[PDB]
Amino acid sequence: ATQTGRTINGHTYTDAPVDVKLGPNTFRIPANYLDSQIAPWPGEGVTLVIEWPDMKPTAPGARANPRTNDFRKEIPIRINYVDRVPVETLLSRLSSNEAITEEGSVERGDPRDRLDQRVAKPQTLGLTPYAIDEAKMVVYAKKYEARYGKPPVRNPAYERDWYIARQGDGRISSFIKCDGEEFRRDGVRLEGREVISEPGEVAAGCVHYFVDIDNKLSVSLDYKRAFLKDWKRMEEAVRDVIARTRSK
Ligand SMILES: [Br-]
Ligand SMILES: [Br-]
Ligand SMILES: [Br-]
Ligand SMILES: [Br-]
Ligand SMILES: [Br-]
Ligand SMILES: [Br-]
Ligand SMILES: [Br-]
Ligand SMILES: [Br-]
Ligand SMILES: [Br-]
Ligand SMILES: [Br-]
Ligand SMILES: [Br-]
Ligand SMILES: [Cl-]
Ligand SMILES: [Cl-]
Ligand SMILES: [Cl-]
Ligand SMILES: [Cl-]
């Protein structure tokens, strides 16, 4: 309860901790982490926000309208208690197509949405890029056309670049999908602490997944592809929050 921001519509914004339930655990999260900067929205899970480049929360109340922070620096963080699926296999199930294709359908053989049909690329930023295998699309498009009378649609929005990081035993520990350079340009540029946008350009986006197996949490970040180089500091900032705020 140390720091104080504006008072708007009667509410004085502070960084005082707020009790947040995720499964059976209670996390005492400084209010200014929260998307609302007051209390969790109704529903399961919570949304936090951190700010590029130092992965610190928005100053208390600075996101409240009229905002005083720079919205282009925000990185929204959806944290969920995982109780509908196994947390230990979540990242492998997101990177395949068992859920979005029917058992034994032509679409279950789609190489685009299965990690085990994509092609590993050379490491960069500690990530293994995984690319679409156009040779497998030829075979797929044949059985798809012969069975529907139509060649399959190559919609660039659903042909994202994928990135994988792994633990020593091979388990997936990070999974990131980004708009391809064919779908979207970066739409912003960075030098130092500040990000200024390119108008008429839609910023390329990534979604970035990881889990906390011990707390049974999934974490989903949505951020501009221009921020991708700092993916590890983002994980580090969120895992520190999770570690520090959990009520022992
Ligand atoms: Br919230
Ligand atoms: Br609501
Ligand atoms: Br302020
Ligand atoms: Br779930
Ligand atoms: Br390599
Ligand atoms: Br997709
Ligand atoms: Br895995
Ligand atoms: Br993990
Ligand atoms: Br922007
Ligand atoms: Br998405
Ligand atoms: Br904290
Ligand atoms: Cl509280
Ligand atoms: Cl919950
Ligand atoms: Cl590899
Ligand atoms: Cl490995």
Author numbering: 86 to 293, 294A, 295 to 333
What does the paper say about this structure?
Heterologous expression of Smlt3024 in the periplasm of E. coli reduced growth rate, which could be counteracted by co-expression with its cognate immunity protein, Smlt3025. When a mixture of these proteins was analysed by SEC-MALS followed by SDS-PAGE, a new peak was observed containing both Smlt3024 and Smlt302586-333 with an estimated molecular mass calculated by MALS of 74.2 kDa, showing that a stable 1:1 complex (theoretical mass of 77 kDa) was formed between Smlt3024 and Smlt302586-333.
Crystals belonged to space group R3, some of which diffracted to around 2 Å resolution. An analysis of Smlt3025 homologues using the Consurf algorithm identified conserved positions which, once mapped onto the Smlt3025 structure, cluster into the hydrophobic core of the central β-sheet and to the N-terminal β-hairpins. Interestingly, the crystal structure of Smlt3025 revealed a topology similar to the iron-regulated protein FrpD, the cognate binding partner of FrpC, an RTX protein of unknown function secreted by the type I secretion system (T1SS) of Neisseria meningitidis. However, the loops connecting the β-strands have significant differences, for example α2 and the β11-β12 hairpin in Smlt3025 are absent in FrpD. Previous NMR chemical shift perturbation studies identified the surface-exposed portions of the N-terminal β strands (preceding the central β sheet), the C-terminal portion of the last α helix and the unstructured C-terminal tail of FrpD as the probable binding site for FrpC. Although the corresponding surface of Smlt3025 has significantly different structural features at the N-terminus, due to a different relative orientation of its β1-β2 hairpin, the C-terminal α helices and the β3-β4 hairpins of the two proteins superpose well and the N-terminal β hairpins are amongst the most well conserved sequences in Smlt3025 homologues.
